[PDB]
């Protein structure tokens, strides 16, 4: 605890109530010094006897009643203010233990008792030295030297010296002008002394209502939300290139490619196809970075800021007003359900090739078997292939970042099936990126293979027709600008598989634990509200569509999604309580749905989740 090692425990506990140390300057050091004095008093009367009685009688830290009783019996009286520490039967006179910084030039303090002065090094003054014996001097010197070693070890020399001297500063003080500065913005002084008597008044409150029915989320009205994401998602396809490196695949694609525009968007002019063709030609030679051309300015928005500012200045007319920014509200698009359904479509490959960990114990075997089961139940799915495409594209676009390039970089998106064949999903074109921050955008020209074209889903995409080896394909070719932080985040998109794996693992392990035996092949029935009615459904397909929804949620993560998901946890908890015959009560002005509705603006998956919440029952019996 706070006891110094050299201080005896009995002395320390006896000193606790002797003086009010909190109000004294350096209260802990004052207590330590008083303990030193009491220990010196103890050492002076080191089992000395006289006429069958102790030679020295110690007055220090003794109740005043006993002190007066024994002083009266000894025909001695001392005042209350100063009382000698101890009394000697031999050479009858009262002694007081004093600690002084300097042993020289010292005079007796009081004429009623003698002074046994000592210094911090254990030495004693001449009269004290001649009064006491050599053994007492050695004991006192040793104890004081141990105390001095403790002092110098803890860097408390200045505090101890100030305490021994007798006068010291308050250890903190506030001046005059600083006090005036402090009292400028308050109605009380430094140590407030309100004149009001303490009391807790009774205030008329309100009544806590009950959430008899679950809240209904607001469905916004407006045009359907377009597909606003870095890549295509479930509408992604690939061309099966012959086995080889990336250069061979790009050469094979470019040398046999017939590009013809079939749908042009104003957002992405159809003339920037030459940028992609030039990038493909340059990459087919072995020079991924190519020089600028005339249509690169349109493709990557080169210098657009100057013309935009000039147009703004020329058209500037009127009076300055506040910003009042607005966000357009959009409704739930029809393509979200289609995306969910199509993302669950089975594939012929596994698309999740993670090298297995080592296996040493049986627990390791159980864990790896569970992981293998999860991989095989979610691997052969379109969502896994889309996740792989997103991983490859994000990493290959992010790796060519971090520099200040004035040229154009081509980043192919090529995967390889377990047969050697290359799979060309598309190519990302990185333009002039004088990037300095983590949030500033980097221009891109995302060109990739499309499975099906939809005007309302992709209004900013200029769809082309690709003719390779008597086969017809589609090309997206959208102009986007994308930041460093988002690219880095999507470079690690493979982490999305954990949460559906979490659900699967919890179900399987709970089943194993309830019956006290692992199965690893359980495919139970999960009761869910599919079309407003509770119907059974297997665990495997549930995990598959959980993965699909989690992926669709990850690539559409924005402030709206963050707020929506943060504020639906309360409603999710309330629904789980209500399904267990629990009542839910709310404060006076409690509307938990408003803090969710404020986050429902234009995010298609936020609207999808809101509709899913609304469809399922809100009143539980």
């Amino acid at each position: 605890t706070d006891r110094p090692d050299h201080i005896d425990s009995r002395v320390w506990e006896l000193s606790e109530t002797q003086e009010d140390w909190i109000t004294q300057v350096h209260g802990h050091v004052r207590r330590v010094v008083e303990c030193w004095k009491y220990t010196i008093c103890c050492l002076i009367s080191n089992m000395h006897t006289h006429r069958g009685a102790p030679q020295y009688d110690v007055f220090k830290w003794q109740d005043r009643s006993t002190i007066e009783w024994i002083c009266s019996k000894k025909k001695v009286q001392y005042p209350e203010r100063d009382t000698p520490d101890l009394y000697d039967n031999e050479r009858a006179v009262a002694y007081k233990v004093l600690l002084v910084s300097d042993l020289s030039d010292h005079s007796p303090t009081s004429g009623i008792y003698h002074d046994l002065a000592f210094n911090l090094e254990g030495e004693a003054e001449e009269s004290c030295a001649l009064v006491l014996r050599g053994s007492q001097l050695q004991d006192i010197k040793g104890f004081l030297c141990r105390a001095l070693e403790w002092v110098v070890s803890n860097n408390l020399t200045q505090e101890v010296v100030e305490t021994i001297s007798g006068e010291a500063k308050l250890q903190f003080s506030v001046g005059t002008t600083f006090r005036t500065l402090l009292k400028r913005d308050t109605d009380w002084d430094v140590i407030p002394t309100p004149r009001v008597e303490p009391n807790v008044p009774r205030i008329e409150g309100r009544r806590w209502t009950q959430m008899k029915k679950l809240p209904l989320l607001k469905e916004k009205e407006g045009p359907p939300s377009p597909w606003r994401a870095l890549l295509l998602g479930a509408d992604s396809e690939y061309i099966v290139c012959p086995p080889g490196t990336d250069q061979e695949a790009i050469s094979w694609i470019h040398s046999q490619s017939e590009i013809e525009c079939i749908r042009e968007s104003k957002s992405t002019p159809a003339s920037v196809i030459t940028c992609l063709t030039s990038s493909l030609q340059s990459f087919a030679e072995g020079n991924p970075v190519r020089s600028r051309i005339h249509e690169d300015i349109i493709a990557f928005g080169i210098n657009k800021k100057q013309e935009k500012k000039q147009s703004a200045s020329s058209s500037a007319s009127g009076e300055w007003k506040r910003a009042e920014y607005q966000v357009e509200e959009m409704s739930l698009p029809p393509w979200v359900e289609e995306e969910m359904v199509l993302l669950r479509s089975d594939q012929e490959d596994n698309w999740i090739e993670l090298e297995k960990n080592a296996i040493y114990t049986e627990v390791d075997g159980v864990a790896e078997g569970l992981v293998d089961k999860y991989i095989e139940i979610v691997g052969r799915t379109k969502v896994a292939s889309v996740i792989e495409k997103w991983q490859i594209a994000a990493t290959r676009t992010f790796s060519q970042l971090h520099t200040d390039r004035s040229r154009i970089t081509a980043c192919p998106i090529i995967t390889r099936d377990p047969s050697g064949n290359c799979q060309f999903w598309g190519m990302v074109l990185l333009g002039p990126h004088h990037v300095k921050r983590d949030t500033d955008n980097a221009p891109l020209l995302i060109a990739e293979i499309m499975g099906e074209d939809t005007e309302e889903k992709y209004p900013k995409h200029s769809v082309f027709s690709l003719k390779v080896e008597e086969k017809q394909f589609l090309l997206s070719l959208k102009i986007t600008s994308f930041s460093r932080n988002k690219l880095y985040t999507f470079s690690n998109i493979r982490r999305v598989l954990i949460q559906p794996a979490s659900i699967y693992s919890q179900v399987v392990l709970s089943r194993a634990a309830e019956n006290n035996s692992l199965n690893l092949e359980v495919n139970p029935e999960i009761q869910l509200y599919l079309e407003g009615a509770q119907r059974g459904m297997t665990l495997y397909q549930w995990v598959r569509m959980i993965l699909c929804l989690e992926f669709l949620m990850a690539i559409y993560n924005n402030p709206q999604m963050e707020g929506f998901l943060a504020n639906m946890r309360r409603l999710h908890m309330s629904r789980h309580a209500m399904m267990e015959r629990r009542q839910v009560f709310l404060p006076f002005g409690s509307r938990p749905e408003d803090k969710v509705n404020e986050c429902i603006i234009n995010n298609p998956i936020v609207a999808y989740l809101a509709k899913g919440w609304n469809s399922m029952p809100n009143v539980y019996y």
Binding site: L170, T186, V190, R322, H572
Partner: protein, 676 residues
């Protein structure tokens, strides 16, 4: 959302993990913070009265309001002075051991606090450079400022630092001299303004909020003062049942479980948040609570003044406005200060002090998390409230054990009102009470039968760290191990996270496919033998804690001949630029200095690829620290206590080392001859 609500096997509480869009991008802030800063400034004035009267609230210094003025249907800024006094008295009368620990901290721990603890902070506003600087730089420049304005040396203790800060405030003119050379001038008013100035700035990469918020940082002239009160508040909060802020992790869960006792007829469980926190709390309420605590403890006046300094300085705070509100004429975009042209914040023009704006109400910043927790906890202590309360800063959970539903409702309303008495408003849309207890939430920890694991709160840490392969592998595996231990990830999720981390970690170091590293290893016939080199994983689920090299050596996957090369302490890859000192246990010469390298050749340093005088000064400090450590091995185990200055101390130490070197006398003389 219907796919996230199972009904047969597991409950929605276990699927709360699915309500997380993490692994997606985190929102960022883009433009001016002026609108957000001004909104935080104006909100406390809008909540003082039941009917918003901003103009009538700006002339109020201490926000104290009658019990009939306290808004019950909305946020209420201000406190009731008598309520604060009585509730602080009640909180002191109970929890006497906590007050005893407070007295122990004041008597013992407080004098030993060093101002070097201020160096632990992150970016700090600098009153000298008018910028945000790392805490060590700002602390050191502030110490130099105090030393050269008070013409004395500042003691290592925090009390001496605070006394120096108070003493400089007494001067009329203060000056700062620093190497580039340049001299800056401060008046008493200028330095007072810089003392009470909070540098506002955006909070980036924050998840869970629709609207971006603004964070602030104070100067070093007040961080020291806040340190004492924060430490005292922590000391009190560690010893009270109703606190939840000083404990965390599994200890917080154990404390929560200690209170989940539902035995009466009606057992509720209220879990909610406090709305408009950090701006409905008048610092004067915290002043009064601390003053009551110190009075009932018998403390002297100086400690009371010391505890009251920071809250008054925050009463006189100057929030730094951003780079101006955005104004548009047509499609133009111009940024203008608050008072240039009318806006929705015209009422606050009178508080503009240069580029900063004053606000006498609220805190504007979470600099008093522990003190605000104490203010929340004192209001709980009253006869009507008999339940169990846990409050961290503004997230709380309450457990009711009542005989009747009406009694529980009365207790809940009493809780709301007593929180409102001290300026704390329950968020009505965020507070939910379940009449049979068993389902609740606290600090995003949901419990139904036990605190369920929350996957996707560990996913952001699954990316390789980017230091070097050994450190990255070790810390990734140990993060996964901790997640498994805490119950967040089970066997399957743990192993899958291991596999994903391993695959990404091998990719990041050019160990997958055909890369330059793999090509060089292939053409030179270099078998990988290591995870970062493309070898098969050696780590398993049960061997997350084992080091890669030791495990491979034990399993025979790494022969001794290659071990003699990988773990060479003289490899050029990790060779240090300067010699280092080594111990020699039971030797004639116990210290030997020689060139050294980090043993592992894969612990290399990656080049980073791109107040200067203060940095050179840091380098000088590092050199002095290195020589002190070399000459004084005992300061590595205990605090430095040698007397005299550094030069003489090391001179005598170097001498004494020489006369114990067991050499010839004349050789010792020639060694001493060249000592400066």
């Amino acid at each position: 959302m219907n796919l996230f609500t199972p009904l047969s096997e597991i409950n929605p509480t276990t699927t709360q993990e699915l309500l997380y869009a993490y692994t997606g991008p985190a929102p960022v802030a883009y433009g001016t913070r002026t609108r957000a800063v001004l909104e935080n400034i104006i909100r406390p004035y809008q909540y003082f009265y039941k009917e918003p009267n901003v103009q009538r609230a700006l002339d109020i210094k201490t926000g104290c309001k009658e019990p009939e003025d306290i808004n019950v249907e909305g946020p209420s800024s201000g406190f009731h002075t008598a309520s604060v006094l009585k509730l602080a008295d009640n909180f002191f009368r109970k929890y006497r051991p906590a007050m005893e620990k407070l007295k122990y901290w004041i008597l013992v721990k407080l004098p030993k606090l060093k101002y070097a603890e201020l160096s632990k902070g992150r970016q700090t506003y600098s009153f000298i450079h008018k910028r945000n600087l790392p805490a060590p730089i700002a602390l050191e420049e502030t110490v130099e400022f105090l030393e050269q304005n008070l013409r004395r040396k500042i003691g290592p203790t925090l009390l001496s630092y605070c006394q120096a800060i108070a003493d400089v405030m007494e001067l009329d003119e203060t000056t700062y001299e620093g190497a580039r050379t340049y001299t800056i001038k401060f008046s008493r008013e200028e330095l007072w303004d810089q003392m009470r100035t909070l540098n506002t700035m955006w909070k980036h990469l924050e998840r869970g909020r629709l609207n971006r918020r603004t964070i602030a940082t104070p100067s070093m002239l007040i961080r020291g003062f806040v340190k004492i009160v924060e430490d005292a508040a922590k000391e009190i909060l560690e010893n009270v049942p109703t606190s939840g802020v000083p404990v965390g992790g599994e200890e917080k869960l154990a404390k929560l479980a200690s209170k989940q006792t539902f035995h009466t007829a009606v057992t509720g469980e209220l879990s909610g948040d406090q709305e408009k926190f950090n701006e409905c709390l008048d610092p004067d309420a915290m002043r009064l609570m601390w003053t009551v605590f110190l009075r009932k403890l018998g403390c002297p006046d100086w400690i009371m003044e010391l505890f009251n300094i920071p809250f008054m300085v925050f009463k006189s705070k100057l929030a730094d406005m951003g780079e101006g509100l955005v104004y548009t004429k047509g499609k133009l975009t111009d940024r203008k200060p608050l008072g240039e042209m009318p806006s929705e914040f015209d009422d606050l023009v009178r508080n503009v002090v240069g580029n900063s704006i004053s606000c006498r109400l609220g805190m504007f910043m979470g600099m008093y998390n522990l003190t605000s927790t104490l203010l929340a906890l004192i209001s709980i202590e009253r006869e009507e409230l008999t339940g169990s309360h846990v409050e961290s800063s503004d997230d709380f959970i309450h457990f009711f054990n009542c005989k009747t539903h009406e009694e529980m409702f009365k207790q809940a309303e009493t809780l709301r009102l007593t929180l409102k008495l001290v300026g704390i408003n329950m968020s009505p849309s965020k507070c939910i009470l379940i009449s049979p207890a068993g389902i609740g939430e606290f600090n995003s920890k949901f419990h139904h039968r036990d605190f369920v694991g929350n996957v996707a709160t560990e996913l952001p840490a699954l990316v390789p760290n980017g230091t070097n392969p050994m450190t990255d592998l070790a810390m990734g595996l140990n993060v996964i191990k901790h997640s498994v231990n805490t119950g967040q990830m089970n066997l399957c999720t743990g192993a899958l996270a291991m596999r994903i981390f391993n695959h990404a970690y091998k990719y990041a170091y050019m160990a997958l496919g055909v890369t330059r590293r793999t090509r060089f290893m292939e053409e030179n016939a270099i078998t990988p033998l290591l995870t970062n080199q493309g070898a098969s994983p050696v780590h398993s689920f049960s061997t997350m804690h084992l080091d890669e090299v030791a495990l491979r050596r034990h399993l025979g996957l790494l022969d001794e001949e290659t071990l003699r090369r990988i773990l060479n302490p003289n490899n050029p890859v990790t060779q240090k630029g300067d010699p280092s000192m080594f111990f020699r246990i039971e030797n004639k010469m116990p210290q030997i200095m020689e060139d050294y390298s980090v043993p592992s050749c894969f612990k290399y340093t990656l080049s980073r690829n791109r107040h200067k005088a203060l940095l050179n000064k840091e380098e000088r400090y590092q050199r002095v620290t290195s020589i002190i450590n070399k000459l004084f091995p005992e300061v590595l185990i205990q605090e430095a206590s040698a007397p005299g200055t550094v030069r003489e101390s090391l001179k005598r130490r170097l001498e004494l080392v020489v006369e114990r070197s067991d050499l010839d006398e004349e050789r010792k003389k020639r060694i001493l001859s060249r000592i400066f």
